[PDB]
Amino acid sequence: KSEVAHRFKDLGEENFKALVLIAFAQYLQQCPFEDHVKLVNEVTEFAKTCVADESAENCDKSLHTLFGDKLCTVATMADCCAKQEPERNECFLQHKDDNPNLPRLVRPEVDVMCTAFHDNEETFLKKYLYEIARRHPYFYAPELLFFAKRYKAAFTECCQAADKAACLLPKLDELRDEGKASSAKQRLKCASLQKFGERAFKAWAVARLSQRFPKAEFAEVSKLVTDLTKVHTECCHGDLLECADDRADLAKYICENQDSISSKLKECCEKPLLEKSHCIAEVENDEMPADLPSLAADFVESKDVCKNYAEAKDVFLGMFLYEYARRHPDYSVVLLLRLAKTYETTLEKCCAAADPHECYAKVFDEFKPLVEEPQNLIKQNCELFEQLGEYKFQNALLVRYTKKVPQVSTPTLVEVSRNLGKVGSKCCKHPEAKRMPCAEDYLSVVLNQLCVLHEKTPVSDRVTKCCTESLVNRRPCFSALEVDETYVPKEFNAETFTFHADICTLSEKERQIKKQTALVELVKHKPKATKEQLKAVMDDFAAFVEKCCKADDKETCFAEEGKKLVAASQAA
């Protein structure tokens, strides 16, 4: 009874107040900061009355009831409040915006920010949680607390340091970059649960955890998957308090049972809570017993397989994925899942036909082309990555993917292609025994970010097709797409190819965005243009963007010479 009191007792006021602000800012994204803080405090003072007396005023109500009722004291969508629980919460989830119409979060001067932090400490943190949760409504809530704690620590020392700027900026860029990664990775976890089901998540966890805790028994990995699924099920459906509380329940059980799980968790468990759970998620793979028997025994070369399979199909298939994953930390998670269903298929087929053992004999030969295909793409794209730059490797993927799906909105095409290009620096560096999990599972995260940005205003049938068909075959589904022949080229708009002298005031990162954006509009205009025709026009831009930022008259340099640029760039 009194769940709000149970979660307040288990989390503490600070984390309770913080998580509720995230929950509110995630749902009602467009409501300003001060409005959300009003609701949070009104709930918190109400929670304290429940901790003091759990049977008192409305304390026995569900969390979704209290939160949804409270949320809708400002919500004017409006239709989402004629409904009851869970019907209201369900439509609160489906109304989450992966691209809220919110301004670009401009950063003030370091002296100005440091003043604000010292002005009000607690207010400055809430405004960090508010602007992140309202723009990433699928942000892992417990991680965002650890992000806030670290966002707090970055300002504590760098506002007290000699050169505040050189201390703070690289810390705020490191947090922002990893912050996006934590949202995009979590966005893929919430897609699986909501769009594909509980079993599609369990299969994901069994493979990844067995890769990371290879020495742990199957019964131990199944327990971890069960509790971890429940945690992300709560976080993906808006049950943030139960998600954060049960995520601590998980980290506790992991750390007091390290002997049965992993040897790499020693230091992770000596850390405080928000760092402990963050450490266990980021811990590297343990060593595999090395003395494991070949997998053919008990899944192929053994008899009574279709009797062990039929007897309990899910636990038997989990045992196969468990056994295959722990032996292969060099495989990507998606591959292991492909082999899980490929193995499951050949059982469904061969556990009915005459003499089962016959047709499932060399099922391991079906795995061979499945393993080769990503290795031949990662090896090839890594070769392409290193003969170009990272920025050039993005320009190549911009042309390659704008030709694949030219219906997709240009800002989404650019944003996704840049996140696609970042796999090179991140994973090509690693050896080929570490490349596949790094490279392909990261591309899975980037392609899901393309799905959700496209699912809002769908425009490309092939994007919808690949995104809805499956999770594990998404990467090859996009990898197989060729140049869209049917796409009618977009007409020449004089606005979309004219830069202005204000580009000389933008950062090198933002100036890349603008030049890279003009590349998409160029490919959408001449989708039959060759690599050498687009490089011949892309170089004319950067030279034009560089000579017209030093010329004493900048405005008239971007003019006239900016129309001597477009007329020359045409024909091809």
Curated annotation (Swiss-Prot):
Matches recorded under InterPro entries: ALB/AFP/VDB (IPR000264), Serum_albumin-like (IPR020858), Serum_albumin/AFP/Afamin (IPR021177), Serum_albumin_CS (IPR020857), Serum_albumin_N (IPR014760)
Protein's name according to its UniProt entry: Albumin
Keyword Metal-binding: yes
Cysteine-cysteine disulfides: C50-C59, C72-C81, C80-C91, C114-C159, C158-C167, C190-C236, C235-C243, C255-C269, C268-C279, C306-C351, C350-C359, C382-C428, C427-C438, C451-C467, C466-C477, C504-C549, C548-C557
Residue(s) at site: Aspirin-acetylated lysine: K189
Location of this chain's protein in the cell: Secreted
SMART domains cross-referenced by the UniProt entry: ALBUMIN
Residue positions, PTM N6-methyllysine: K524
One of the GO biological process terms: cellular response to calcium ion starvation
Annotated phenotype, changing D259G: In Nagasaki-1
Upper lineage: Eukaryota, Metazoa, Chordata, Craniata, Vertebrata
Domain of life: Eukaryota
PTM sites of type Phosphothreonine: T410, T412
Membership in a protein family: Belongs to the ALB/AFP/VDB family.
